Amino acid sequence: SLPENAPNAVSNPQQFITPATALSAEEYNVHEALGETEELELDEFPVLVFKGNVPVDSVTSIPLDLATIYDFAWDGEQNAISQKFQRFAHLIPKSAGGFGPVIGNYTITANLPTGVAGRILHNCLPGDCVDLAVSRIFGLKSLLGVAGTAVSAIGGPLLNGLVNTAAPILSGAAHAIGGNVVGGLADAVIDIGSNLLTPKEKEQPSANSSAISGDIPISRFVEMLKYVKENYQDNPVFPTLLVEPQNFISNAMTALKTIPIEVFANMRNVKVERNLFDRTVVPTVKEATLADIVIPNHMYGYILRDFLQNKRAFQSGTKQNVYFQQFLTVLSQRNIRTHITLNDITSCSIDSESIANKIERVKH
Amino acid sequence: DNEVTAEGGKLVQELVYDHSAIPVAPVVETQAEQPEVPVSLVATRKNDTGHLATKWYDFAKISLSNPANMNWTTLTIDPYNNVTLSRDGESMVLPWRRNVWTTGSKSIGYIRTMVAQINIPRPPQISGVLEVKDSINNSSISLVEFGGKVEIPIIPKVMNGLATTASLPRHRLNPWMRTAESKVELQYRIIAFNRTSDIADLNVSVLLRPGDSQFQLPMKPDNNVDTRHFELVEALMYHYD
Amino acid sequence: DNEVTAEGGKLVQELVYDHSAIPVAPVVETQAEQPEVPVSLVATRKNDTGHLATKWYDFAKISLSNPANMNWTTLTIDPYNNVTLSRDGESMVLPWRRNVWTTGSKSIGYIRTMVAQINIPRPPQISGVLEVKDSINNSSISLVEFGGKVEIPIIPKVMNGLATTASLPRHRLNPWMRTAESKVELQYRIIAFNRTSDIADLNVSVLLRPGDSQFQLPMKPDNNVDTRHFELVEALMYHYD
Amino acid sequence: MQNPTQTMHIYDMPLRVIAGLSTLAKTTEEDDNTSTGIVVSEVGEPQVVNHPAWIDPFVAYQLRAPRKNITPDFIFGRADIGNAFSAFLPRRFSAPAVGTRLVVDPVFTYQQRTVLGLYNYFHADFYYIVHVPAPLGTGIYLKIYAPEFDTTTVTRGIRFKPSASPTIALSVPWSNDLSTVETSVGRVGQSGGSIVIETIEDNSNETVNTPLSITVWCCMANIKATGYRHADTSAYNEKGMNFIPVPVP
Amino acid sequence: MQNPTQTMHIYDMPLRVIAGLSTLAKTTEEDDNTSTGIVVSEVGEPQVVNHPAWIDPFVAYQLRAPRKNITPDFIFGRADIGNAFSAFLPRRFSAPAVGTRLVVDPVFTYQQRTVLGLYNYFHADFYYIVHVPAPLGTGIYLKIYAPEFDTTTVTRGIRFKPSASPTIALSVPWSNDLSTVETSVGRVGQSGGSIVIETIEDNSNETVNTPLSITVWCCMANIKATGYRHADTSAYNEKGMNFIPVPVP
């Protein structure tokens, strides 16, 4: 499933704000003829990966590490995506895209009243290139400058980021008082491969809800998706979702901050192999929060270069100069391991000021 | 090809369970077949037990000595709350904690969910027959010669016909068994035995594929092991006034 | 036809030597066939080893115990000067003392002259594999199950490929081996072994038909045994400055 | 235009077993141990394996599913060693206790280590022939599978009785999330070519000398190496290729 | 039944000259130096040589007559290396005086010395490409042949003028009374693959920097080795083929 549509040579500006990621998928190195498709009903539950408030005019990272992921719409220990990583050793992507092999989609949704109005920039970078993720988080670069970025305007008078399910019962709710159940069942049984409207979500459009969604790529060198958690700190595989709310004014023409959103995810694009029994080392889902980000050893000079080619990171009192003094301090620390964390570049101490942080770093 | 051995049994083509839902030799990364429904009027879905039904899992070891009395011996298999079938990764409790209802197949005339394999290695200096009863009630009997292999599908304890203290009306009327009350149990005894002065013990193991179990209502995965209090089965199956 | 035995092996049709120059069951007064030449460009004659190639001769006995180390064990067969192969009457040294040159056959890809049979009788309470290497070098391997029969043709020590102290230029260029320097040797070791508390020793014997050896220049019979001085092999294979 | 591929030939196969075992079946029609009770297999019925380092064909259980093995060829240097200098090498092990576990690690010949030592990265498939000689009062019941992540993880494999089928044979293909690991390092968490032997039961006599020995042959089959290692441009000379003049008196 | 011959492939030919010389003729119809006066040849007209370690074909003078080279195969071990890891390797020499003599001894690559080091006896053919860059006032007249027994013995060869044909190429086959000499020893009195360069005349200007340099490429072509050398039956292991478990915290 989850096809590979061929675009045109030139992208039409009325649909896309960036060029296309590629004109063909990138299915080398992935061993697609290897597993066995395993469609159980547990795969059809989505996962509430992120829920909460998100600051306006700042890129927010959502580390989308599906092996150790937590579900905020469920109180249990495992969920629909992480139990798939408990049961099997090998997960094999079905198809691919312009970034890498792709294993799922995400969905951003936000129920807003009509008195606020803004827009959302979103992109999901594979994690083979985490520099482009981290440079966007630190305010050094914007999301509009990398291919694959979409813009969706949640306001509104606008029916964009919204979820409408219409329950999967065999009755279809044919005796409903004062209105029609739109797109539920006993309208159309639209296939997962096809992409159509039912017939009733063509004149409704409150229940049609043009979604804010992308895909979940992994990385373009692995053959399958065997998770070890020591190897993926050295060569990361799982992607990172980048979200940026831009304008968001109120009816008093006052710029808002910290809007509420929530992100759903599913992984319905994989094949399985090597079913495992009574194992000891498990992928250890962290309770109640998240994963963080891993910056490996060979990514340091790429993060270092992007601060240096930024005129705003040198002047004091700005947000980029805070991260850059926190970045130079962590490089002068003592690391027994071969990677640092984004949280280490947020909860660190401070010195004075920029140049002496670099002279002490070329000696260490 | 030339060694003195005492191995050989029924050659499982002659056994009567399914041989496609419980495959004799599945291919290395393939998935097993979906089992048959009890009746055409129940709800149906895609199976979530396909990869799990290709794996005989180590459950328990029983010792096969010279019997003294004539009594049976009950082996209780509760796949819902048992810290041997819930380890990490792909364990057997995973279909029983994603679902609300569960059932089996009615190919023999009664519902019969989980299957157990008893394979017996023996030296040539011991011989005998193990007798395995399908449930607590006077159900079907499987005879296991020493040095042979057999598979025994098991009745759930709910559907054995006996009137117990719990005994809900949906137990005799519905084939759907709310998943936490789905324990199965078999009885065994040694029915024939002869030996020499060389061996006396003859330990065997019980393998536990979850063949022809079905499920109905797909929830989101519940927590694996209840590490709080183990008194919960007494507040579940006794029900004081 | 009904006894408990543990005998049976490869049924020598599946072995690869000749089966006509080394016959499996020759008729009682007949003569064996002449072996094949290494190449069509060497000299040829009538064979003088035809009646001798129908007789497995008792050479040596080796003991087959539980091995401790992993080392090989070399068995040297020098058919020219050895007081076991030169008794009286029809002995095996007789073609090696009427001739100037000798060679073997190249059916496997290298010259391989004398053949040895290792037949193993065993009680049922012991089992294992004997591993026989064709020469000192990394040549072909013959596996001998206990309770079985195999025939192993042997490379001469001259043509094993190793560069030794003697190492004449005709050794790598000519297939003809001046008859006194024609010793063969095989290596053996126990590669698998299991037993019980009944037997531990398992003696076997090595039989030594002179299959597919050829000869070139027919002299008049030299004397059989050199009963004067046994230091002659040190003035023949060391050659001080 | 591509630089030409050159071939070298090896001629007559050192350490080849030319007299095999009689208890190991050659065809699938002469093997019915899965049917009655002797082998309880969770990976299927055994398929026929033809390998040059063993004289006669044999049936082997597929411990992993057979695949194609993508070989990336973008860097400088590539070689197909491919059953050259390949042998079934034996080792002896004692059977473990009921709780413990035995991991057999693969081995390979000296001449395979030399030629593969000209490169940096490799992958290969593996074969195993397990033989348990069972004297009389043997009631051993064994279990063989392939290890995955750690010490306790169990996968689908075979269970068998050595008293009625003494020889079993296995087929272990290359399964890894990275093709072409480094030879001396490997990926952390890889399977490689290891197998796992485990004792289920011991229903033997008192007279049988227990902890009964196990013999395991291992052959390292089709090898494809990648990455040309020695950047030596200097020239070498040996006396065999020279002009040696006759010494003048 | 013979033990099977195994083949290994080498893939894309290290140190291959892919941009050759323009003064070396590709066909015999574009070469007439024997006709007028430039090359005085006593061994015939040059024949076309196709070799993989040089991109374009070239005409070479046969310093010895071409033959078949019997290879005796009766001992254990045989290999056809056969243009594998083969290269034209250059060296510089100064031109000798009129009385003296220059003997060029053949060379071969490191990777040829490794694989041929698994055997004891060998033979091979040889090729030479001689280039004398002649600036302006060059009147050199050279002489090339193959040495036979001692220091003074002269055979039939070629004489040429480098001012009008700067590049000459040669073909030296294996000629010896013993096939397969020992590699490190050789036969006493053998020819091998050596050539001999001798200066006849020096009719150059006073401005030319004399003793003018000579460049000689040498390639050691078709190699057949005999006699398997290392009798090592022990088994070896590297970390790339093992099972490396994930380290537990």
TrEMBL record, chains D, E:
It comes from the Viruses. This is Capsid protein. The lineage of its organism: Viruses, Riboviria, Orthornavirae, Pisuviricota, Pisoniviricetes. The chain holds residues 1 to 249 of 931 of the full protein.
